[PDB]
Amino acid sequence: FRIGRSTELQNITFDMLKVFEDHPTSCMVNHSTYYVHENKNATWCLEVSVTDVTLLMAEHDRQVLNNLSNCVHPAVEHRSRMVGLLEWIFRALKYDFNMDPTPLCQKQTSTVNETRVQINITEGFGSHGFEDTILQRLGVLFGSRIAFSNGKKRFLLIRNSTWKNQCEMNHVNSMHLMLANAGRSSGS
């Protein structure tokens, strides 16, 4: 691009792969579905979804009360990394376990082979504006416009899954995730 007879408009594009290969990243499939990935070579991931379907019940499932680690089965080989990444996500949400609604996770004898963590974001369950806080935090973390949309039941659900390259990693999302988790060790 030639601005004038002695001036040219030039550009450079960065490659942020080696900076963020070994750190947690995230990406958006659509405005309701997000994926968090421990590092590039991890064969598993955690998807975060805004749902209108009640998947866990207080009468059948476990309350997360300072025991989030119990929500992952002891036989999972990446159990420690899974619990870590769950904590990374909870810090990224600015979640306050003292005042925010108590999350639910699946019963210990669940037949389904995935870890569910359910936060009730239905209006009136938490304080006024708690659901808007969660949706706007999702927009900050993943670039979601779900907060900018039109009182039924909603839930923020984090479930584990196998990594199938569902979405391409976003290094801006990586910077948001790491900034919300300053001081927590990462990178191998």
Ligand X SMILES: *[C@@H]1O[C@H](CO)[C@@H](O[C@@H]2O[C@H](CO)[C@@H](O[C@@H]3O[C@H](CO[C@H]4O[C@H](CO)[C@@H](O)[C@H](O)[C@@H]4O)[C@@H](O)[C@H](O[C@H]4O[C@H](CO)[C@@H](O)[C@H](O)[C@@H]4O)[C@@H]3O)[C@H](O)[C@H]2NC(C)=O)[C@H](O)[C@H]1NC(C)=O
Ligand Y SMILES: *[C@@H]1O[C@H](CO)[C@@H](O[C@@H]2O[C@H](CO)[C@@H](O)[C@H](O)[C@H]2NC(C)=O)[C@H](O)[C@H]1NC(C)=O
Ligand Z SMILES: *[C@@H]1O[C@H](CO)[C@@H](O[C@@H]2O[C@H](CO)[C@@H](O[C@@H]3O[C@H](CO)[C@@H](O)[C@H](O)[C@@H]3O)[C@H](O)[C@H]2NC(C)=O)[C@H](O)[C@H]1NC(C)=O
Applying CB under 6 A, which residues contact ligand X? 44, 62-65, 67, 70-73, 75-76, 105, 110, 113-115, 160, 162
Report the chain's C-alpha Rg in angstroms: 19
Residue 27 in tokens = 């990406």
Q: Binding string, 164-183, against ligand Y, x = CB under 6 A?
A: ----x-xxx-----------
Q: Which of 150, 151, 168, 182 is close enough to bind ligand Z by CB under 6 A? A: 151
CA 69, chain centre distance (Å): 16
Our finding on whether 62 is near a second copy (CB under 8 A) is: no
Sign of the C-alpha dihedral, residues 160, 74, 178, 90? positive
Our finding on whether 9 is near other proteins (CB under 8 A) is: yes
The option from ligand Y, ligand Z, a second copy, none interacting with 168 (CB < 5 to 8 A, set by class) reads ligand Y
Number of shown-chain residues binding ligand Z (CB under 6 A): 10
Residue 14 makes CB contacts below 8 A (sequence gap 6+) with: none
The option from a second copy, ligand Z, ligand X, none interacting with 137 (CB < 5 to 8 A, set by class) reads a second copy
* Binding window for other proteins (CB under 8 A); candidates: 41-49, 53-61, 64-72, 138-146: 138-146
Is 185 in contact with 21 (CB distance < 8 Å)? no
Q: Binding string, 114-153, against ligand Y, x = CB under 6 A?
A: ----------------------------------------
Reading across the β-sheet that carries 33-37, which strands appear in turn?
A: 25-30, 33-37, 44-51, 155-162, 116-120, 104-105, 62-63
- Between CA 148 and CA 137 the distance in angstroms is 12
CA atoms within 13 A on the CB side of 153: 10
Number of shown-chain residues binding other proteins (CB under 8 A): 41
DSSP code of residue 61? S
| Residues near a second copy (CB under 8 A) | 65-66, 68-69, 80-81, 83-84, 86-87, 90-91, 94, 97-99, 102, 123-124, 126-130, 132-133, 136-137, 140, 183-186
